[PDB]
Symmetry: C2
Subunit: 122 residues, 2 copies
């Protein structure tokens, strides 16, 4: 069977696909990550973006929310926020995804093993 080697690799692909919605870059691996959208209301996203003081060259700047990641549920919500901010900011060349991903992974990499089990485990 498949077990994906790198939560980093999978999350980068997922979030870039939420940004461009290119059906040639869809992957069935993404449907367990799309279920996490329920953890964040669409009406809260504009406020999260305002609070992160995001400019045109920024992806999600999750550390500026001053919302801690203490458990896997908190980690799942950071993926959901990343996903909806990525969708809402639009497909644009100037977005420095590397900086966004540096912040996301600093905040959640501790949870990667537990996230893989919880999402794709039997």
């Amino acid at each position: 069977y498949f077990q994906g080697a790198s939560m980093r690799t999978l999350l980068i692909r997922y979030i870039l696909w939420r940004n461009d919605n290119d059906q040639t870059y869809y992957n069935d691996d993404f449907k367990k990550l799309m279920l996490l959208d329920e953890l964040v209301d669409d009406g809260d996203v504009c406020t999260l973006i305002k609070n992160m003081r995001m400019t045109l060259s920024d992806g999600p700047l999750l550390d500026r929310l001053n919302q801690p990641v203490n458990n896997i549920e908190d980690a799942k919500r950071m993926i959901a926020i990343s996903a909806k901010v990525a969708r809402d900011i639009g497909e644009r060349s100037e977005i420095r995804w590397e900086e966004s991903f540096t912040i996301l992974f600093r905040m959640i990499e501790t949870y990667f093993d537990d996230l893989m089990i919880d999402l794709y485990g039997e």
Copy 2:
């Protein structure tokens, strides 16, 4: 017709696919980038990795080569080195791709428009 919005997004996807060789993550956008493999001999890759002083947690650390990027040809060769180092280091969770991509894009983002034209232009 298609014209891809973000050389960042395309290069991250390309290099992660060169790393895991997952056929579910292949994209026809990648074949123009695979032609650049000729710019770097397979026998030079072990030396480039040694010179970059790469550990288990590192992707390509291109700035440690002290090889400048002065033109699009130099930029294309940095994508080829990234591609073959990614393939050669193997699929591993500890690789901090964000740091690798931060370095690559600092070095080549000036060339993104000229790279898009040269690779995918008519």
